Amino acid sequence: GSHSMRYFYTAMSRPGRGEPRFIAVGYVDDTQFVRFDSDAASPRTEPRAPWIEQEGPEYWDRNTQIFKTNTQTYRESLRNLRGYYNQSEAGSHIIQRMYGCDLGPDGRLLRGHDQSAYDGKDYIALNEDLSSWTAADTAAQITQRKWEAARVAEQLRAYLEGLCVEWLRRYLENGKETLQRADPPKTHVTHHPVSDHEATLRCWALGFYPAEITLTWQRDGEDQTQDTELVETRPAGDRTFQKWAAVVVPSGEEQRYTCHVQHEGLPKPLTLRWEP
């Protein structure tokens, strides 16, 4: 129902090893559709999803111009932040930026995003009002004054409320057979004895899209959050995702445990038990 578009920029300095690398990737929901890498033999925006290929040469040339410009801009920004923090020219540092729009299940703009980080720490973020900034420290405050002076917020707001939503809806239509298709998880429970009086119940969810999913174990109807081992949702490599949740239970008490699965693709939440 709900959909989002997001661009992720990573700019990485590397003194003694050339100018900072700039990488940009674009996603609709959990589907990447473009990439750009300033380190590539011949740097250009490239397609990473079938439905984007139909876009014309104007589209690709415009994207590449933007990312090439960004490559240079982010190199200057890296120099700037090094200075803001009085850091050595010997160190490697990273600026990250993520921005994009969220749509509701009806297609309307839910909210916009634009956040930056430096060395993995929040640095500056456009507020939900799309009009004001939140700066993490006195360094980010300098960036803030700069951006206020250039009326950056006003331009992001125009983008996020306009072009971002328009293009997202276009992509959603062009890729509707996949982007607007929720694949439910294939689920089962496996049993792995660990000792004479304990065994592991592992609840599996496989082949689902999008990545958002809830896997929980209950014992006698009570959530076992603190005793459940929950691995991070991982990509299968075919656009689908995998996840499992495990609990160590007393042997013979297996039937007191139930696994519960919530996923957008499910006509109704699932309850599973180990089936000997």
Binding site: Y7, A24, L163, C164, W167
Partner: peptide, 11 residues
């Protein structure tokens, strides 16, 4: 489609 930097806006 990505956002164009305004003219051309460093941190």
């Amino acid at each position: 489609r990505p956002q164009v930097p305004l003219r051309p806006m460093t941190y």
